[PDB]
Amino acid sequence: XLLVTAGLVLA
Amino acid sequence: MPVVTDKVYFDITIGDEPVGRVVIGLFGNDVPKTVENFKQLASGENGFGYKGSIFHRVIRNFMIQGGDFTNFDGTGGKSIYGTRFDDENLKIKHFVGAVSMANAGPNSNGSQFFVTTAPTPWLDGRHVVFGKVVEGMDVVKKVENTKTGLNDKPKKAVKINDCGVL
């Protein structure tokens, strides 16, 4: 998807 | 509309060429603790902070992400209160040019932040918004338009060559 992490970073 | 109480600037280079200044207005009456953390990291007054760090992840029509002055790749950074600190207020909505805390789940703000360049309402209630771009949206445009490679890393480094508090 469109996310904004900090370590992993998902779809 | 939250009110702008302080402003900070970033002078940006892309592969070493100066590309201008972004000025960020901070919502210090609504998220004082988050705004303190950002100011102090911009002034560098604790002996560490944004100067010389990069925008390590840039997605066109979405956002630019930076603030990881420990590892330079999105896994690091730290607040002025220690590694991580709690979400201050999650009621302020995102909008184009919002400046917001990256995190890794609840109550894990550090130093990593993003500037959005389109609407991102699916982030609402999940990331603390604490500021907006009040000058240099043209410069923010250049950054979001650099060529990127693996996991959206700019090919030329996008550096905060200087920053501080106006």
Short mmCIF file of C-alpha atoms in Angstrom, two decimals, chain A residues 1-10, chain B residues 57 62 65 74 102-103 114 122-123 127:
data_model
loop_
_atom_site.label_atom_id
_atom_site.label_comp_id
_atom_site.label_asym_id
_atom_site.label_seq_id
_atom_site.Cartn_x
_atom_site.Cartn_y
_atom_site.Cartn_z
CA UNK A 1 0.00 0.00 0.00
CA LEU A 2 1.40 3.64 0.47
CA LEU A 3 2.87 3.74 4.02
CA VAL A 4 5.53 5.79 5.89
CA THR A 5 7.47 3.23 8.59
CA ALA A 6 10.63 3.26 10.22
CA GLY A 7 12.16 -0.14 9.75
CA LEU A 8 10.03 -2.60 7.81
CA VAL A 9 8.05 -0.72 5.10
CA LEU A 10 4.86 -2.50 3.99
CA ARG B 57 12.95 7.43 0.51
CA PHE B 62 3.18 10.66 -2.41
CA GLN B 65 10.88 10.89 3.93
CA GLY B 74 15.11 4.56 7.54
CA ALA B 102 7.12 8.56 10.43
CA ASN B 103 6.69 5.75 12.95
CA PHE B 114 7.82 13.12 5.80
CA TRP B 122 -5.32 6.94 4.73
CA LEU B 123 -2.58 8.03 7.14
CA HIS B 127 0.88 9.64 12.15
#
